[PDB]
């Protein structure tokens, strides 16, 4: 609506306050080491970051 209820619902926490830094999705998010990236968002870019598969 107008400027007092369009974004009035608080989002300082919870699952609605964080999204995929790649595709904005709000499910299966990885926050470890400040990754802020999806489960699938991350598997695509894992080698570019440097997360190599050793074992």
């Amino acid at each position: 609506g107008h400027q007092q209820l369009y974004w009035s619902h608080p989002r300082k926490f919870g699952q609605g306050s964080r999204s995929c830094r790649v595709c904005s999705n709000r499910h299966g998010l990885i926050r470890k080491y400040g990754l802020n990236m999806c489960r699938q968002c991350f598997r695509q870019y894992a080698k570019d970051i440097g997360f190599i598969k050793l074992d």
């Binding site: 990885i30 470890k32 080491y33 489960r39 991350f42 997360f51 598969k53 050793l54």
Partner: protein, 104 residues
């Protein structure tokens, strides 16, 4: 002045980190700066275990991603001033430094 400096080196691959340590101490030994042997901090292993599939179907397989951070410390303790003496870093990509005075 008398001064003492410490250079810490952080990297992801062992070979580069060993090279940059080796030529740093080698240059200082020729330069008669007293060098304390490069002490190796324990390696940090950042482990992220996700699920291979992008959906829910499968036979419950897990993918273990691994990241290794290697840290070294090199102490230069010469009787005279040091920062004006040594002014080259001779770094290769993948190696990050942080100069620090021994007071800190």
């Amino acid at each position: 002045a008398i001064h003492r400096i410490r250079i810490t080196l952080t990297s992801r691959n062992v070979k580069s980190l060993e090279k940059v340590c080796a030529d740093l101490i080698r240059g200082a030994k020729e330069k008669n700066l007293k060098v304390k042997g490069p002490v190796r901090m324990p390696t940090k292993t950042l482990r992220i275990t996700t699920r291979k599939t992008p959906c829910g179907e499968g036979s419950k397989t897990w993918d273990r991603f691994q990241m290794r951070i290697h840290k070294r410390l090199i102490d230069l303790h010469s009787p005279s001033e040091i920062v004006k003496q040594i002014t080259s870093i001779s770094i290769e990509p993948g190696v990050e430094v942080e100069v620090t005075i021994a007071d800190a």
